[PDB]
Design a protein around this ligand. Sequence first.
Ligand SMILES: CC(=O)N[C@@H]1[C@@H](O)[C@H](O)[C@@H](CO)O[C@H]1O
Ligand SMILES: CC(=O)N[C@@H]1[C@@H](O)[C@H](O)[C@@H](CO)O[C@H]1O
Lengths: 514, 516
Amino acid sequence: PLPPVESLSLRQAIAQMIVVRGAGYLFDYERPYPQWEADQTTLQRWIEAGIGGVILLGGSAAEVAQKTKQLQSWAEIPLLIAADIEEGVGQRFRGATEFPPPMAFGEIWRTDPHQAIALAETMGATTAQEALSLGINWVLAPVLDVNNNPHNPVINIRAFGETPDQVSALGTAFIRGAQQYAVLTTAKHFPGHGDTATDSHLALPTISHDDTRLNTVELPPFKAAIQGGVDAVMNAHLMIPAWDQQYPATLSPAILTGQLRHKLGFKGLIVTDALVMGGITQFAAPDTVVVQAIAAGADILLMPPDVDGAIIAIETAIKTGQLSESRIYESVERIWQAKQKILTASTFPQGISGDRPETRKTVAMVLERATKHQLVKISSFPDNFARNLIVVDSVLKSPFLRPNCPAIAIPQRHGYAAEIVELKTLPRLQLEAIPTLIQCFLRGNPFTEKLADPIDVLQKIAAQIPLQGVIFYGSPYFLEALQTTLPEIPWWFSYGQMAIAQAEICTSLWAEFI
Amino acid sequence: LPPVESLSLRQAIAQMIVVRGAGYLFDYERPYPQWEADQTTLQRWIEAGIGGVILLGGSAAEVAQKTKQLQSWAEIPLLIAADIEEGVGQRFRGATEFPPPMAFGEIWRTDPHQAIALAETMGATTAQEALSLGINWVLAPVLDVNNNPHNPVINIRAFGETPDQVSALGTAFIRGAQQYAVLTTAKHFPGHGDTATDSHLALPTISHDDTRLNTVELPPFKAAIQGGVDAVMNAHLMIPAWDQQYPATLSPAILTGQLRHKLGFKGLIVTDALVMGGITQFAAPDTVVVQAIAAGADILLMPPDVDGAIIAIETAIKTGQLSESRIYESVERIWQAKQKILPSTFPQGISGDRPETRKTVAMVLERATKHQKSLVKISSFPDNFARNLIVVDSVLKSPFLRPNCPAIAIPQRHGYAAEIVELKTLPRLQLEAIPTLIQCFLRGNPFTEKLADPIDVLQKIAAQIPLQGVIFYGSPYFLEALQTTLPEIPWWFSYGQMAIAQAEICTSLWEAAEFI
Ligand SMILES: CC(=O)N[C@@H]1[C@@H](O)[C@H](O)[C@@H](CO)O[C@H]1O
Ligand SMILES: CC(=O)N[C@@H]1[C@@H](O)[C@H](O)[C@@H](CO)O[C@H]1O
């Protein structure tokens, strides 16, 4: 059960407003990012001190099930446990179901809205159901950003489309689908990251548009989701000069309170986007940030750089009259209302879809319909006489490439043998001139300063080398420039980078056990 | 367990079979569908009375789920095996990963007493964590003596280059694991140590006489037999001196004569995986299986066709080419082992952060390490000014490389930006000229045609580039060539490829805003 609010000490109350960051992996030494991800002693200590929630990245699903069990066992007040699963729990945690990125659904809506809505619906339902089963009760999604800028490095295919109505529908469908289970759902990133070429992880972006446009494009998904009863809204770190010329949205009273809590009438959790992000740490000190953000009306501080001193800063702000105890508890009340929703509810593996056919088919359907082509069928050759050239953003970021994955195995049956290189390395690579297939896995994500421009390196290569064809996985936006730069060579494209998206494409083109 | 005679001849036969499966809970997750039984097949074969399963892949948590699942379908408890040579964590992450056996041999050169005590800790921690996950059959230690520095498949998987060295370390590992109820397996009799040919690809030819075999190859295996190793796995090797017509796997002279009789091994005699090209190029799947049992094997590991093996056996019993009493002899020995294996529940039993365990791993890596000069430091540069060139065998085969791993992160802080490339791509890559650090993780393993040989391509790069240093992880065998061919470039070497090994070496060369 949940204890009455006023029974908390001012410190326990403040602590609730803080969400820290762990790893899915059980042990300290497995942590990929020890700078940002607390160890067990620090995590237990925080939870026993009343920390409000934990956001987890990394680990197999079976592990997260084990982590969240452990984490919850240290908590007197049940923890909000969040993970960013946009593409489905499978995106974050191997062993759960990964869906194709939202922009894939975007396609289907253009052509067939009634069906697109319904897929997003079960996209949300399944995401919501598997999450509960891993012990994750807070889904930070849907992304409601309207992507108007082909060059947007951070949002890109994470988005349901380029127009507000497309995004409105497909985003509320997802919320509707998840609403079938008890998990918080999160609209992000207010008031939309849609238009920039700049990534707020790297630096502070500025969207120039005025209030008229802002209500015309950026806002409606958000309006829709709030009327929808989305549980939480995560703002981005952005300069919105038409609303505030001083502060980024994270720190602005006019934005978080004036525009959002008041004008749009959002009664849920206003959540700062991660507070360790380059965009914001560059703007102000970690303590200025926490206090100013609460001032601005944020209910939840997501991943503050210094947690121990942040609580202390808020305590000191409260004594110096810069904030008041009542303010803190208004935030607790909202936190209670959401912790109330999550307490009503799955034991791993039970609830994971797995080999369940109905799910596998839904994933395959979405890929198929969202696909884009020129039909053409390419050449076959004898063993290792040809080259399957796989080009990826980073190799440490390419989990979708695994031994015997369709993108490798299939072109191999046909004589092309795989070479895997990073797009940044390619230009400096001297290729044997032999029939060659190029598959680029490239898309936008967090920590992408600018998108991939394979077109130049490719044209150089079409002249140097006998291209059979080029497959693009991930971002669509470079097709326009591909058809224009190289009409000669046929191309195929899919939104999915995953094994089953690979299988579909590669098939259409036509011994090791350990 | 039920009396041995309660089993139908079909179930007796079935106990002699161990099939391959993946740790991942679901079918679509299997990286090797051809060899790895889907969940339906696995359930059918188990209910038919199959002897055991061998698992590959999955995190440790994933695997505990799997094994619980598999034992539930079995009336006779299954042997469940994985090849955890390097610690359960080699296979299923989340469990403990030890540096490879050779690193223990390295220590043994200068300080045998420690090296033996460390090896025993490796054995005990490995048995302990295995039990935790539901893995009762540890296929290890490898007893091969690696004489041949060019040996592709064994390489650093061996505890060393001499019989006395392997016997000591190998038996320690055994005595360590003997603190828990698990089967230990010696591999791969009569030792895969000296060949340049990987038996996964082709049938190795072994020209050594009987005397040489007893001098080098065998003595480790005897030490383990007197030490009580529960099972002995045999290699597919043509040893004419022993059998003119058959590989070790299919030869009664070798398995029955040399192993069972001459060495008096009373445990499980296990074939090497029967899907390997070394054996399959030799005979049809059904001949292979019956000739295997003929020669005295108690366990048929991963027969290429399972259902067809059982038929083929039943038939040969009819024609009396095999014998029914001969099937129950092997079931006797399987009964003896299963008697033993009859734990604790995951995450309990997993060492995790236990500082004794973490220090053991760290000490091994640290005492096994090699560097050209007493101590040397590398220059530092401004951000993204220099090059960190990571060279690996295969990118899909390199799980020790993850985002922000020390090998990437540490040089990064000193201004060397990451570039990852496969050794096969390297000689064709024209390098930008900035001071460069090269780290190649290259080692012997299953499915290796030839040992990766960087010496030539490095030498070419060395003349064209301001090379700061070369670091090798894995196989030691090219260091002499490095030292001779590039005496002016400082080098560092470590047996381990994992985070902790990168961390150690890289830190020593000198003295991120990214969260997702
Ligand atoms: C614009 C953007 O990348 N937003 C993400 C947000 O979805 C996520 O929840 C959090 C980190 O977990 O902050 C950012 O990394
Ligand atoms: C020479 C060699 O490496 N043989 C390995 C053996 O180590 C392994 O235990 C077994 C089943 O996995 O068969 C082969 O893959």
